[PDB]
């Protein structure tokens, strides 16, 4: 079986889910999590349901969870393939952080886009240049990609 840590995090995630976040292990791989983040209220993504996958690499928790959007989203820190620029996923990882905190941080990222530390440079420039329009695009994309999906 698994490290007891992974069993404990999983029991606690299933028994006490993060609000706005569905997260459950794969029937056949307890290290793989099917995730759905609801677009935050008062964000361009409101009404959206965003699919995400999370994977615990064999070195976890000494290595960060791998996470990616599987739903297309217009956001300065998410690229075309759904990869996520978030400091705790890379150089600010600590093994005292949990899946719960990775999930909360991504949710919070949706509510608080960071164009100044871009992954998606086009989206970021548009977020700086013309925020209003960048927000309306994010809205349209929510409707296009993140509704009945």
């Amino acid at each position: 079986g698994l490290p007891r840590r992974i069993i404990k995090e999983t029991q606690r995630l299933l028994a006490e889910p993060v609000p706005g976040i569905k997260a459950e292990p794969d029937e056949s791989n307890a290290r793989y999590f099917h995730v759905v983040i609801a677009g935050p209220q008062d964000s361009p993504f409101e009404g959206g349901t965003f699919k995400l996958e999370l994977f615990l690499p064999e070195e976890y928790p000494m290595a960060a969870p791998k996470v990616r959007f599987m739903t297309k989203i217009y956001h300065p820190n998410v690229d075309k393939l759904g990869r996520i620029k978030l400091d705790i996923l890379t150089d600010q990882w600590s093994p005292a952080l949990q899946i719960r905190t990775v999930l909360l941080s991504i949710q919070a990222l949706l509510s608080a886009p960071n164009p100044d530390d871009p992954l998606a440079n086009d989206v970021a420039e548009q977020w700086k240049t013309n925020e209003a329009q960048a927000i309306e695009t994010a809205r349209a994309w929510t409707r296009l990609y993140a509704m009945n999906n």
Binding site: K85, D117, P118, L119, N121
Partner: protein
């Protein structure tokens, strides 16, 4: 005109500039003093980044002002 540029080490050089000198001119004169290609240089004065085409005086840089040289990254 005389200005100090300061790296993260705390090494400070000194340059002969003019207030009508553009950022490119400096970056070029940091290069011939330190050997750093201009496309690797990011100069900062009082919190704000200093873009290439522009001039010294635009950012209100005056005699014995201190600029901060850090590396110009690919983007993160």
């Amino acid at each position: 005109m005389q200005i100090f540029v300061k790296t993260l080490t705390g090494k400070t050089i000194t340059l002969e500039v003019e207030p009508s000198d553009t950022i490119e001119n400096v970056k070029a004169k940091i290069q011939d003093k330190e050997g750093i290609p201009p496309d690797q240089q990011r100069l900062i004065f009082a919190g704000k980044q200093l873009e290439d085409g522009r001039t010294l005086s635009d950012y209100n840089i005056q005699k014995e002002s201190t600029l901060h040289l850090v590396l110009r990254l690919r983007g993160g």
